Structure formats: structure tokens, C-alpha cells
Design a protein around this ligand. Structure first.
Ligand SMILES: *[C@@H]1O[C@H](CO)[C@@H](O)[C@H](O)[C@H]1NC(C)=O
Ligand SMILES: *[C@@H]1O[C@H](CO)[C@@H](O)[C@H](O)[C@H]1NC(C)=O
Length: 123
């Protein structure tokens, strides 16, 4: 079975709870494996709407990854030919579930917009 030590985290500072998880090996994750990858880390496979919320907080990636309900997405703020072919927004493809990509994962415990930037403590 998939093990967590086979995974690497490509978004070290989660935005609105969202990270991106890839396989260290060349072969990446099909849709079912993407869900398992997030769960091995205690996360859920992100929904496209959760990725959209992160984009509004300036979450941007340059990797295609699975989200819930069988879409592959990339999160783009700036047009880039090499990152989603100059698209902008959360770009969405409905792709056969056997295809292998990264996984967008969601962490509901995050209380900061950027998990690496503290926010003022309210007492
Ligand atoms: C996804 O990969 C797993 C390997 O862990 C395999 O058992 C499963 O059949 C694959 N799903 C598809 C739709 O290819
Ligand atoms: C999820 O978020 C909580 C709160 O920020 C944090 O303690 C935990 O380490 C996070 N887990 C993962 C796998 O990102």
C-alpha cells in the first residue's frame, strides 16, 4: 500500500488549509490514491471550492493535482505558459480517474490564513 514516506509536501505554508502532496517517485497518484495520500497525513482530498477559497488568499501552484469529485486542477494567479497554459483561476479538467497527478489536500484544523504567518491572539 501507499506509505506516507513516499510523499512530499509541495506547499509548505498552507493557504486556507490547502496543501499539495506529490509522490517522490516518478509515478504519481490516481484519483483513489490521491484520497489515500491525503488520509495518510490526516488530511482530506480538497474540494475545488476549497482550492478556490485558497486562491482568493493568493494560493498558487505549478502542478496538476486531484480534487474531490474527479477533477484535476491547478491554481493560477498570474498567466504562465508553463503552469496551466496561461490560464487564470482554479483551472479544472474532468479527467479519467486512472490518470496520475498530485493531490490537493485540505486541513480543517488550520486557523491561520497562511499556516506560516502568525495572527494576533485574541484573549
Ligand atoms: C489506482 O491505483 C490503485 C493502486 O494502489 C489501483 O488498485 C486502482 O485500480 C487504480 N484505479 C484506477 C481507476 O486505475
Ligand atoms: C493541520 O492544521 C493544524 C492546525 O494548524 C496543525 O496543527 C497540523 O499540523 C496540520 N496538519 C497537517 C497534516 O497539515
Amino acid at each position: 500500500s501507499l506509505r506516507a514516506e513516499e510523499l512530499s509536501i509541495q506547499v509548505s505554508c498552507r493557504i486556507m488549509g490547502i496543501t499539495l502532496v506529490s509522490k517522490k517517485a516518478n509515478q504519481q497518484l490516481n484519483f483513489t490514491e490521491a484520497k489515500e495520500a491525503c488520509r495518510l497525513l490526516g488530511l482530506s482530498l480538497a474540494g475545488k471550492d476549497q482550492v478556490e477559497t485558497a486562491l482568493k488568499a493568493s494560493f498558487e501552484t505549478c502542478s496538476y493535482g486531484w480534487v474531490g469529485d474527479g477533477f484535476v486542477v491547478i491554481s493560477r494567479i498570474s498567466p504562465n505558459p508553463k503552469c496551466g497554459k496561461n490560464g487564470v483561476g482554479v483551472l479544472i479538467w474532468k479527467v479519467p480517474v486512472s490518470r496520475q497527478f498530485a493531490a490537493y489536500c485540505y486541513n480543517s484544523s488550520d486557523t491561520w490564513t497562511n499556516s506560516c504567518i502568525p495572527e494576533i491572539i485574541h484573549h
